[PDB]
From a paper:
Biotin-dependent acetyl-CoA carboxylases (ACCs) are essential enzymes that catalyse the ATP-dependent carboxylation of acetyl-CoA to malonyl-CoA. Eukaryotic ACCs, instead, are multienzymes, which integrate all functional components into a single polypeptide chain of ∼2,300 amino acids2. In addition to the canonical ACC components, eukaryotic ACCs contain two non-catalytic regions, the large central domain (CD) and the BC–CT interaction domain (BT). Here we provide the structure of Saccharomyces cerevisiae (Sce) ACC CD, intermediate- and low-resolution structures of human (Hsa) ACC CD and larger fragments of fungal ACC from Chaetomium thermophilum (Cth).
Using molecular replacement based on fungal ACC CD and CT models, we obtained structures of a variant comprising CthCT and CDC1/CDC2 in two crystal forms at resolutions of 3.6 and 4.5 Å (CthCD-CTCter1/2), respectively, as well as of a CthCT linked to the entire CD at 7.2 Å resolution (CthCD-CT). Owing to the limited resolution the discussion of structures of CthCD-CT and CthΔBCCP is restricted to the analysis of domain localization. In all these crystal structures, the CT domains build a canonical head-to-tail dimer29, with active sites formed by contributions from both protomers. However, MS analysis of CthCD-CT and CthΔBCCP constructs revealed between 60 and 70% phosphorylation of Ser1170 (corresponding to SceACC Ser1157). The CDN domain positioning relative to CDL/CDC1 is highly variable with three main orientations observed in the structures of SceCD and the larger CthACC fragments: CDN tilts, resulting in a displacement of its N terminus by 23 Å (observed in both protomers of CthCD-CT and one protomer of CthΔBCCP, denoted as CthCD-CT1/2 and CthΔBCCP1, respectively). The CDC2/CT interface acts as a true hinge with observed rotation up to 16°, which results in a translocation of the distal end of CDC2 by 8 Å. The interface between CDC2 and CDL/CDC1, which is mediated by the phosphorylated regulatory loop in the SceCD structure, is less variable than the CD–CT junction, and permits only limited rotation and tilting. Analysis of the impact of phosphorylation on the interface between CDC2 and CDL/CDC1 in CthACC variant structures is precluded by the limited crystallographic resolution.
Author numbering: 788 to 1032, 1036 to 1133, 1153 to 1212, 1253 to 1379, 1386 to 1464, 1469 to 2187, 2196 to 2259, 2300 to 2311
The structure:
């Protein structure tokens, strides 16, 4: 069949709209959605279509009514087709109205014409508006057609089509329409894909916010209400477009500004053309809030060569904003592009990290750190190319004006070239591999300008061969500082496609470990508005990321993060922003939770503080499945020249990440363990694992206490919350600061924590400091930073009063030499040919001398005619090589010595503790040693090398447990690192939470106070005195001691076991215990391997005697229970004197004996000396323990059946009851001896007769002598009896061992409280003993005042009655205190010529 010459595009337009009409109306016609849509857009844009639609219809209508009109219309069409392009639609309207409805007489006899020319009239009307407006007509029709059918299904509660059909019963015309609308809804899936493809095509609403945009504004707003699940996705897309409803008009705006820049008016002059572009006008574009890069890409292009220059200026000034300005030079060569700009503030600028003097690039976080004094400026070059092939000529010729950073623009938005464009830019860089290299340029960018508002694609080549870093893509090597990326350094990053060019998603996998697979998002937002704006801007950019993470998928990701940088300097403060944050996070949260996103970081600026920015970075983490991790920071520099994370958040400062650089490289997965490994090879836990060891130990302290003591158990604080620690790291002004940061990454070789542990004694909490060395951080050696640290912790624990715990694992002081001077120093020999012939000295070359000078003290002496700088002393730049470490070591040494005498001090040998470390163990006095860790002074191989022979092999052979516990350096032996902590937390249970705080007393509970002491020692043989303290575990039942069942903890019992020391509880009251071992113990000292003859020496320390080592043990213990611990004491005095044996005398027995007396005068808390049953206290022993030493705190008691005299009754008898004295008493009691005495006295008997009486008596006296001897022994023993002691007032009372417990419980408690009341009396009176009579009933002069305040008659006695009075009248004494406090104020103010000065001081 024949066809019309020009009807191809008309017929092709009428089918491509029809192939889309069938899908929207719900018919089966399914044809390729993307291709037929683009073909419809390509037939609405061609100027031939209006003519084509006319030529088809008019051909049949030529032979219609009055031809007069038919011919005149044809003339217009034919002329407009060749001459000019656009269709004369409006001319064709005018001619038809004039002839048809207007020329009623001739043209239209009757109203027939209207119907005939109707198809032509429906052509000149769709084109009257225009050709592109005809395109918009058939996109205000297909974007209304969808809404028309779908809205009813999302309509007035009708979600059912059948219910809808019954509702439709209303319209007659809807008879056919009922089914048509139902047919459409069924195939909505195909419809959604068509509308979405149409919404994406007209999405460049940003460029044209009028032609394609305003025309579509109302017919698109009728597409956001469709929230219904089916249309949900399409409604969201509609919203995107509306937000956009500028660049088309901006094309004009910027074009004008560039041209206005060129020729400055300055009316009254002929030639402004030559004048280069002016800042004032161009400034408007460069500093604008709007995106400029989005359109600018076409202006360097196809324009006047001068305008191309002006555009290049706009671009440079906008991007290199953070950078500095310096001479813009435009040269006009073959390619008029040549913009030569020169210039980085790097310290007070953008939040960056600067150490010493250094300046780095935006992308290159490592340029040249050395310094920027001997470094060039970075010469710029930006070229506008037209084609990709032609671009090469703007490279080889471009580079010639470079004696740095270079940018290259293009004009071919033809296609979205990827990989092929990368294969089209790489042949130009590999060819000029020496050309770009010679000029020393680091960065090269390639901008590709798209005309439909698509953000241009950037490709950057960096390094020596310029391998092209895939990291910087579709973004500028300037916008890059804002992208950071220097935080994902420990990750192999590879980016993935993003629909939005602002956002860049990166695949990150740990450099060491590949398991860690995370999607890190990096976005830079440019807020282009003309406080609620930024929070609404956050919703737009986070939604963009959520939709992009959707298409890439959640896949397999452990964690996901997204960074959103705000280029805006808005006036707000974080306090209100913290409330608005809460609002949108609960909505986005569930979506972010599916994508496996764990945290989000927002970096905003706040001009309102100064009217200068306060950059507030905020991290929101979804931890434990809970957020609440809303940490609001502040970008402030640490003084150290670095920008740190100073948070003033809302999660109550118990947060994470604090006072940390902005350059942290987001720690990966597993980075924690290799560190653990190096500690574990040494048999010690990694330092940061210890806080949790303590938690389990406290957890354990409760689980046992709840058993023994029920009821008082419910205050248990679960598994967690047992302890509440926070790290310690040196502050700004070297003043320790509480930080709650991630474990590991310690700044120094020492770490500390402030722990608030809820112990069962202090269930509300108790604090203490824990200091430990990182054995991984340089062998755990003691450098100056480590020393300054340790000190400031000691200082802190002291300030409070809370105990200190040191965990030792070190290698003495630090080691090093000057490494830098090793491959530079020269030698001056006696003879240069034979260097073995001795060397004169060591010198340094003049050129190598200037390199250091301050690192070496060099003297000048000319030898061989050379300027030789002989080294007279080496200094070295680095710290920790000599004396610097020793100075610090001595300081902390002193600090620990001072701390021991003030607060509770304790150390733990978790691993090898050498040199200084070893001493801090002793200065720490109270120490626990783990079975496989030595306290060594000098290295075991170092000793062998010095002696010349292999004597010692093990560091334990001289530092181990078998030495330090057996000599009293170690107080206890722990099987493992935890066992240590366990036994320590145990000591802590005996000690008050603070310094001058009441003891950790409990209810009588495991052992009641009102029980009699069952175990009584056998008088014949020896007994384990330990049984008298805690109790004797016997075959037949269990006989308890005078202290609580299972409460005793023995210490130092491996050295001088002749005295037993420990801590125990008396009816809940904890106190110090010292007792005398009765059994003959045998300590055997080991043989020294150093002297081969030295043998193991046998020493049998017979029980109940004081030896040099026993005395020292006694003395040490007294001071230990006195300083820090502050415990009451009980001494079961049972020594019968001292060993005056030569060896023991020479072994300075007397020196340590005095040390008991010294230690006793220093004590504050009450001390009880109780001689137990069978217990003895003769001569030398008594003296060093008598209450008159410290009558203020000592109290002495003796058992009813105890003994105490000047000497043993066996010793006194040959001095005061000699043989002659026994015979005078014999001739008195014995009847036989005095009868025989009557014979010799009367005489009258011969020489043989007198011999008889002599030989009769000296036989009778020989028989009576052994029993008469024992009589005097008993007689002498009656002197050393208890009754006598109470009678001469050397003891307070005679005590029955059975009811010792019962007496002391109340006497202990009575003295505890009384002592505190008296201390309080003095604190109020002045806010600043003398005889044998010094008895505790007269220990204080206030015990007279307190006596009358109480009102109890038997005050000095009836201990129980007294205690109970204080407890009741705690208010009445606080009444007396304040009375006296104001009375003492009156005395000091009255005591204050000096009156005339006071009458001047008052006037002031």
């Amino acid at each position: 069949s024949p066809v019309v010459v020009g009807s191809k595009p008309a017929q092709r337009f009428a089918v491509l709209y029809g192939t889309m009409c069938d899908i929207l109306n719900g018919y089966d016609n399914q044809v390729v959605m993307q291709q037929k849509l683009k073909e419809f857009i390509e037939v609405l844009r061609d100027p031939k279509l209006p003519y084509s639609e006319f030529s088809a219809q008019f051909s049949a209508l030529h032979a219609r009514m009055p031809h007069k009109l038919d011919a005149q219309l044809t003339q217009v069409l034919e002329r407009a087709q060749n001459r000019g392009a656009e269709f004369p639609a409006r001319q064709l309207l005018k001619v038809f109205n004039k002839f048809l409805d207007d020329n009623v007489p001739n043209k239209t006899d009757q109203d027939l014409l209207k119907s005939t020319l109707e198809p032509l009239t429906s052509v000149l009307n769709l084109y009257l508006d225009g050709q592109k407006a005809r395109e918009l007509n058939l996109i205000a029709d297909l974007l209304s057609m969808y809404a028309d059918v779908e809205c009813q299904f999302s309509g007035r509660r009708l979600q059912d089509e059948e219910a809808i059909l019954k509702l439709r019963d209303q319209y007659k015309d809807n008879i056919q329409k009922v089914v048509n609308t139902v047919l459409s809804h069924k195939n909505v899936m195909s419809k959604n894909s068509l509308v979405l493809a149409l919404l994406d095509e007209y999405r460049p609403n940003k460029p044209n916010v009028g032609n394609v945009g305003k025309h579509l504004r109302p017919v698109l707003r009728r597409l956001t209400e469709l929230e219904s699940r089916q249309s949900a996705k399409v409604s969201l897309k509609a919203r995107e477009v509306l937000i956009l409803c500028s660049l088309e008009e901006r094309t004009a705006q910027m074009e004008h500004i560039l041209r206005s820049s060129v020729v400055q008016s300055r009316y009254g002059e002929t030639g402004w053309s030559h004048r280069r572009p002016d800042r004032e006008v161009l400034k408007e574009v460069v500093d604008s809030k709007y995106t400029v890069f989005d359109v600018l890409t076409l202006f360097f292009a196809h324009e006047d060569p001068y305008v191309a220059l002006a555009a290049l200026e706009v671009y440079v000034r906008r991007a290199y904003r953070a950078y500095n300005l310096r001479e813009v030079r435009y040269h006009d060569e073959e390619r008029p592009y040549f913009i030569d700009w020169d210039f980085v503030p790097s310290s007070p600028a953008t939040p960056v990290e600067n150490d010493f003097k250094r300046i780095h690039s935006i992308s290159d976080m490592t340029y040249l750190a050395r310094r920027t004094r001997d470094e060039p400026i970075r010469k710029g070059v930006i070229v506008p190319c037209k084609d990709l092939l032609d671009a090469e000529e703007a490279l080889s010729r471009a580079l010639e004006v470079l004696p740095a950073v270079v940018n290259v623009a293009v004009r071919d938005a033809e296609g979205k070239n990827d990989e092929e464009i990368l294969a089209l830019i790489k042949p130009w860089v590999q060819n000029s591999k020496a050309d770009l290299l010679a000029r020393r340029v680091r960065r090269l960018t390639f901008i590709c300008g798209r005309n439909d508002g698509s953000y241009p694609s950037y490709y950057t080549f960096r390094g020596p061969d310029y391998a092209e870093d895939d990291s910087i893509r579709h973004i500028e090597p300037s916008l890059a500082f804002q992208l950071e990326l220097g935080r994902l350094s420990k990750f192999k990053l590879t980016p993935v496609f993003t629909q939005n060019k602002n956002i860049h998603v990166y695949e990150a996998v740990g450099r060491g470990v590949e398991t860690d697979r995370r999607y890190f998002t990096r976005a830079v937002v440019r807020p282009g508005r003309l406080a609620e704006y930024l929070i609404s801007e956050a919703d737009r950019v986070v939604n963009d990321i959520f939709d992009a993470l959707e298409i890439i998928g959640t896949n397999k990701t452990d964690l996901n993060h997204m960074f959103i940088n705000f280029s805006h300097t808005f006036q707000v403060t974080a306090d209100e922003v913290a409330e608005s944050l809460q609002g949108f996070l609960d909505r986005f949260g569930p979506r972010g939770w599916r994508l496996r996103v764990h945290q989000v970081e927002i970096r905003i600026n706040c001009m309102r503080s100064e009217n200068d920015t306060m950059p507030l970075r905020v991290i929101i983490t979804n931890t434990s499945g809970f957020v609440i991790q809303i940490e609001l920071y502040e970008e402030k520099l640490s003084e150290k020249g670095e920008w740190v994370y100073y948070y003033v958040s809302g999660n109550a400062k118990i947060g994470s990440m604090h006072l940390l650089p902005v350059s942290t490289p987001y720690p990966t997965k597993n980075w924690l363990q290799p560190k653990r490994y190096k500690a574990h090879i040494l048999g010690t836990q990694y330092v940061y694992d210890f806080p949790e060891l303590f938690r389990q130990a406290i957890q354990n302290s409760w689980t046992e206490a709840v058993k023994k003591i029920p009821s008082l158990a419910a205050k248990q604080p679960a598994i967690g919350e047992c302890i509440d620690y926070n790290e310690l790291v040196l502050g700004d002004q070297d003043n320790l600061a509480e930080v709650s940061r991630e474990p590991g990454m310690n700044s120094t070789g020492m770490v500390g924590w402030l722990i608030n542990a809820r112990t069962p004694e202090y269930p509300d909490g108790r604090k203490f400091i824990v200091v430990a060395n990182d054995i991984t951080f340089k062998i755990g050696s003691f450098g100056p930073k480590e020393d300054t640290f340790f000190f400031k912790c000691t200082e802190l624990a002291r300030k409070m009063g809370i105990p200190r715990i040191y965990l030792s694992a070190n290698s003495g002081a630090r080691l090093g030499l000057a490494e830098e001077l090793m491959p530079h120093f020269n030698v001056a020999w006696n003879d240069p040919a034979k260097p073995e012939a001795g060397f004169k000295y060591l010198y340094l070359s003049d050129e190598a001398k200037r390199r250091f000078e301050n690192e070496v003290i060099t003297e000048e002496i000319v030898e061989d005619g050379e300027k030789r700088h002989k080294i007279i002393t080496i200094v070295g730049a680095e710290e920790g090589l000599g004396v610097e470490c020793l100075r610090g070591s001595g300081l902390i040494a002193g600090a620990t010595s001072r701390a021991y005498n003030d607060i509770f001090t304790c150390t733990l040998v978790t691993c090898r503790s050498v040199g200084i470390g070893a001493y801090l163990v002793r200065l720490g006095q109270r120490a626990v040693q783990v079975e496989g860790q030595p306290i060594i002074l000098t290295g075991a191989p170092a000793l062998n090398s010095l002696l010349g022979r292999e004597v010692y092999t093990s560091n334990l052979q001289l530092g181990g447990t078998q030495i330090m516990y057996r000599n009293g350096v170690s107080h206890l032996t722990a099987k493992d690192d935890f066992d240590g902590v366990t036994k320590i937390v145990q000591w802590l249970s005996f000690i008050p939470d603070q310094r001058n705080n009441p003891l950790p007393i409990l209810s009588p509970s495991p052992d009641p106070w009102d029980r009699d002491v069952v175990y009584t020692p056998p008088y014949k043989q020896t007994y384990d005195v330990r049984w008298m303290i805690a109790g004797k575990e016997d075959e037949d039942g269990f006989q308890p001691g005078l202290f609580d069942k299972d409460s005793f903890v023995e210490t130092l019992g491996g050295w001088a076991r002749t005295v037993v020391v420990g801590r125990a509880r008396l009816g809940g009251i904890p106190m110090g215990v010292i007792a005398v071992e009765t059994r003959t113990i045998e300590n055997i000292t080991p043989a020294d391997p150093a002297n081969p003859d030295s043998i193991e020496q046998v020493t049998n320390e017979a029980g109940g005697v004081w030896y040099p080592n026993s005395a020292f043990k006694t003395a040490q213990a007294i001071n230990d229970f006195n300083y820090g611990e502050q415990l009451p004491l009980m001494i079961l005095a049972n020594w019968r004197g001292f060993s005056g044996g030569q060896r023991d005398m020479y072994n300075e027995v007397l020196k340590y004996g005095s040390f008991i007396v010294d230690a006793l005068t220093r004590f504050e808390k009450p001390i009880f000396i109780y001689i137990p049953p069978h217990g003895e206290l003769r001569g030398g022993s008594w003296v060093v323990v008598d209450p008159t030493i410290n009558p203020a705190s000592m109290e002495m008691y003796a058992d009813e059946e105890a003994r105490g005299g000047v000497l043993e009754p066996e010793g006194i008898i040959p001095i005061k009851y000699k043989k002659d004295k026994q015979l005078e008493t014999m001739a008195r009691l014995d009847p036989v001896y005095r009868s025989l005495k009557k014979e010799m006295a009367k005489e009258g008997l011969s020489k043989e007769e007198s011999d008889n009486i002599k030989k009769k008596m000296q036989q009778r006296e020989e028989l009576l002598l052994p029993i008469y001897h024992q009589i005097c022994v008993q007689f002498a023993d009656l002197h050393d009896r208890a009754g006598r002691m109470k009678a001469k007032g050397v003891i307070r009372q005679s005590l029955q061992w059975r009811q010792s417990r019962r007496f002391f419980y109340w006497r202990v408690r009575r003295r505890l409280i009384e002592d505190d009341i008296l201390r309080r009396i003095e604190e109020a009176i002045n806010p600043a003993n003398t005889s044998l009579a010094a008895s505790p009933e007269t220990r204080s002069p206030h015990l007279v005042q307190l006596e009358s305040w109480v009102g109890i008659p038997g005050f000095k006695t009836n201990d129980r009655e007294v205690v109970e009075w204080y407890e009741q009248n705690q208010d009445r004494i606080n009444e007396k205190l304040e009375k006296l406090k104001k009375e003492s104020i009156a005395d000091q103010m009255r005591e204050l010529x000096x009156x005339x000065x006071x009458x001047x001081x008052x006037x002031x």
